[PDB]
């Protein structure tokens, strides 16, 4: 997972 704008996503 990576983080963008404070949230994690695949």
């Amino acid at each position, epitope marked *: 997972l990576i983080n963008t704008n404070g949230s*994690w996503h695949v």
Partner: antibody
Amino acid sequence: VQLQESGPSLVKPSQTLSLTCSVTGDSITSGYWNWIRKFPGKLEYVGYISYSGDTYYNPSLKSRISITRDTSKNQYYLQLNSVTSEDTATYYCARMGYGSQPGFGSWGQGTLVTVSA
Amino acid sequence: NIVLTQSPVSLAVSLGQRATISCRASESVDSYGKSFLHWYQQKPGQPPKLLIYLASNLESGVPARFSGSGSRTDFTLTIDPVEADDAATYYCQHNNEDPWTFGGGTKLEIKR
């Protein structure tokens, strides 16, 4: 990896606080590169610049801050505008990994910035 | 807003005993089957040190006297055995979603 903060000890109210983090032993083109501060009393998250240059800021600071980087120097920077006595704190830079290592694993020693006339 | 409320504010423990500290989140800090809840030690004049990440994983280079458990909104840090070098403030912190926040700290006193 080693991180080291640098910047002024004293900043006057209403001025811009500018800090630098110098990273050695690893490239800032991987990982997440963060700023955190500790007030004289509380720890507060300030924000990051990612491995690809995208940023994430504390929403209560978004109107006053900017995090930028220089991948050729392996440095990243914090700009905080219009400082007040409420911005007096120890400022830290710290590395975060991705989803499998999402803690702040490596930290600089911190630098105390006082906002006063 | 996600508020992390630690308990107790402070505690005193004897050498060799098992110490447990709590962190209660106002809303779940889980996503993707992971709890984005981590624990740090901080001593005076030093930056915080990562002990446990993702609620229960020991940070490499930290001795295995620290462990963690929990999910969703309730988390525990265990120090076992307590040693004199554990005199410090312990913090939880999440990074599940905006805004990322820290707990207020639990001060650990070593009895002697």
